[PDB]
Design a protein around this nucleic acid. Structure first.
Ligand SMILES: [Cl-]
Ligand SMILES: [Cl-]
Ligand SMILES: [Mg+2]
Ligand SMILES: [Mg+2]
Lengths: 228, 229, 225
DNA sequence: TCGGTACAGTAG
DNA sequence: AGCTACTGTACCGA
């Protein structure tokens, strides 16, 4: 909103625009930041009471750990490698099927505070963003192919809605790709901006940030240390 | 009342069923999109509430449809299958000593000519019974069966055993576990009789499941059998 | 004493490089501190052993009858073993207490129950010194104290005091990734409600194990031959 | 309680 | 960011 490339450079020493999604600089820029693919944890509610669910508390401590250590752990598994492997082919096939042009984007922060950001799978020539998924199980691709909007995983929905909150955009493509499918290997939908989600982020996210600052202060740390 | 023949299998898959051995390439091919004994508990599963299909049933529903449309199936539980493969012969040789019946290895067996439903027994016995001979990856699981008997693990395996009897049209089935790590007495088994309650469940539930699969396949322009051609 | 253990296991405690074949052999069939939570687990209503408890029951019986144990946490143990020396050194500096490394400790001659402390302290306390695989877990404890992790570790700590007949126990976490202040610890006092729980539930669990072993023609001790 | 299913939680 | 896959608790109707 008042975010500028210079602010990023002065705080992190990193030139945004030169960041090629997945490189050392990209990992560095996400440290301690409430990000799209993880925000489902922030909006998670107890079924009774007000006590934070374990998944919310776990993400809370994960972000704080990133601030105080200045690092994030690396995990590897077949499903993760699969998604990484076919992302490029998914995007190309999406462009060919939909007829829209996709531009790759590095991280996008909501504002100058750098507390909140998303890393879109692409930005489209029609003003929509793009999220791709390449399910490791053909089962889960089939679930999306047959069910569509109502079949979308709640984590992906929170991720897509958060991306619209961050970028101030109004619509986001959600595409699934399976290279193993003989036919019908690509399926996508358009997810509209949901103001119920926007209201939820406007309420829960700033409170999550204040809670983090309180926690950092208790232990003698301050947000930003991960970048110095 | 099956009208299934080896020629039907050969024409639509290209595979000689008589040459099939459990775990081979042809074995895996012949199981694509097919409702199998080890997975049927998903098909006959009932909701926690309401009248809709339970989550686990919808998952298997999507799993089988995916096999039809991709022509492949992922290899899960590699460690346990390799363990079972390593001790297949020893288990069988010990089972034959203890029981006093001879075991003949079997290819995949389909219920009927539609090739929608099948089982793969660990052997067929000289007394007319089929055989399930597991080599549990964890000794804990062997011990559970050793001490609790049939009643302890009926939740996990009764459906599978009954389905094998539904497929083969047999009246009884051996359910056995072998654990080579046991210092002595590493074989335990029970005999399970054909249960007509389970047979009635398969007769009403399975065909409906098949019909809903064909509906979904048609919705995306696929037909059962594309996995084999 | 080591000579009694040597006579019954064929393993000399003074040796044991950890965690070798002999290290794992000593725990076979033994109710251990980090697994005791399974023994003390109750159903929400009634008296039937919950699945966790039955699972552990069968796991232990399998260890006696097979004389082997599967190995988990290859990644987590490799992390801990790398930093165990630096963890202890920093704990000694912070606490002002000196730590002696301790082999396995059995509660009694029956050798049915044991704990494996990360050290025995000069003030008389025991030590649990963990290097959590995630910095997330370090932070949970750093900010929440023992209230944040009592769910997971109170049983293990209390059981260790039950086994050793000690009155207090250090619970510490070390994280080398922390830019500063990478050691956090609390002192946990002996809880007599936990002691009473063990005095009741542990003996009956052992009795039920021996009953099952006798049913299948096995006896405790066979794993060490 | 029994005999199960749904899903939070979390490793990898 | 990447997507399961397994464990254990919550939950549900009889
Ligand atoms: Cl222990
Ligand atoms: Cl121990
Ligand atoms: Mg992405
Ligand atoms: Mg994606």
């Amino acid at each position: 909103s008042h975010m500028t490339p210079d602010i990023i450079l002065q705080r992190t020493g990193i030139d945004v625009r030169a960041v090629e999604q997945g490189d050392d600089a990209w990992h560095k820029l996400r440290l301690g930041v409430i990000t799209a693919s993880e925000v489902h944890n922030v909006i998670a509610k107890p079924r009774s009471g007000k006590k934070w669910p374990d998944m919310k508390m776990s993400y809370f401590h994960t972000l704080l750990a990133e601030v105080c250590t200045g690092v994030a752990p690396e995990v590897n598994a077949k499903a993760l490698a699969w998604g990484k492997q076919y992302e490029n082919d998914a995007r190309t096939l999406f462009e060919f099927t939909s007829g829209v042009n996709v531009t790759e984007s590095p991280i996008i922060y909501r504002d100058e505070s750098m507390r909140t950001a998303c890393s879109p799978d692409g930005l489209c020539s029609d003003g929509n963003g793009l999220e791709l998924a390449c399910p490791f199980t053909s089962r889960d691709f089939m679930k999306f192919r047959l069910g569509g909007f109502e079949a979308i995983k709640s984590a992906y929905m929170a991720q897509v809605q958060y991306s619209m909150w961050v970028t101030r955009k109004n619509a986001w493509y959600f595409a699934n790709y399976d290279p193993r499918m003989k036919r019908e290997g690509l399926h996508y939908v358009v997810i509209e901006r949901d103001e119920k989600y926007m209201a939820s982020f406007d309420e829960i996210v700033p409170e999550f940030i204040e809670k983090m600052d309180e926690a950092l202060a208790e232990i003698g740390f301050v947000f930003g240390e991960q970048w110095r």
